[PDB]
Design a protein around this ligand. Sequence first.
Ligand SMILES: CCc1nc2ccc(OC)cc2nc1O[C@@H]1C[C@@H](C(=O)N[C@]2(C(=O)NS(=O)(=O)C3CC3)C[C@H]2CC)N(C(=O)[C@@H](NC(=O)OC(C)(C)C)C(C)(C)C)C1
Ligand SMILES: [Zn+2]
Length: 190
Amino acid sequence: GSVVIVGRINLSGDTAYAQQTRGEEGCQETSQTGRDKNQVEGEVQIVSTATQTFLATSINGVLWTVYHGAGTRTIASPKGPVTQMYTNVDKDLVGWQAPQGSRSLTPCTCGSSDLYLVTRHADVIPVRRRGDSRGSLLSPRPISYLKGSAGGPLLCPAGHAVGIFRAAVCTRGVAKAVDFIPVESLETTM
Ligand SMILES: CCc1nc2ccc(OC)cc2nc1O[C@@H]1C[C@@H](C(=O)N[C@]2(C(=O)NS(=O)(=O)C3CC3)C[C@H]2CC)N(C(=O)[C@@H](NC(=O)OC(C)(C)C)C(C)(C)C)C1
Ligand SMILES: [Zn+2]
C-alpha cells in the first residue's frame, strides 16, 4: 500500500502537540487505494504504512522520510498514489513532492550546533551537534522514547531544518546520541 498521513506535529503556536487526523481503519483503507482527501497542514507529518508508523518532514517543497520506514512506496494523495521523487537507500532517505497544504521548513544556513529534535509525541529535545551527522542528547532517553520518530526534524534555534532523524546511538537501551541526514545531503540529493 501507500504511505498515509495520519496526523501531524503542531508547531504553529506556543505549545508543541501531536494531532491525529485519521484513525487506523481509515488509514488501512487509504493505504490500499492511495487516495487521501484529508486536508494537510504543517511541516511535520505523522505517517503510517500497514505495519509501521513514523514521521515525515517538508523541506524545500519535498516531504522527506526514511527508507527503512517507507521503502519504495508511493504516498497517498487526493488524486491517487504519488511516486517518490527521491530514493536513496545508502542515506536511508526518500522524498515525495510535498502535499498541497503543507508548509516547508527552510534549510539552515546558520552554522550553529545547538539543535532541537522533534519527536512523534511532540517532545522537543535539545541536541548538541557533534559532527556532520551526529548530535548528543543533553538528556539521554530510553530507545522507546525515540522509536517512531525517524523522519522527524532537527531544527536550529531559528527554526530552520538542520537534518532528518535516522537512527539512535544506544548503549544498554539508552539513547545518548542521534544520527541524522544533514540538510546539505538533502540539498545534494536534490
Ligand atoms: C543507519 C541506520 C539505518 N539505515 C538504513 C538504511 C536502509 C535500510 O533499508 C531497509 C535500513 C536502514 N536501517 C537503519 O537502521 C535501522 C533503523 C534505525 C531506527 O530504528 N531509527 C529510529 C526510528 O524511530 N525508526 S522507526 O521506529 O520510526 C521505524 C518505523 C521507521 C530513529 C530510531 C529510534 C529508536 N535503527 C536504529 O536507530 C538503531 N541504531 C543504529 O543503527 O545506530 C547506528 C546507526 C549508530 C549504528 C537501533 C534500532 C539500534 C536504535 C536501525
Ligand atoms: Zn538556522
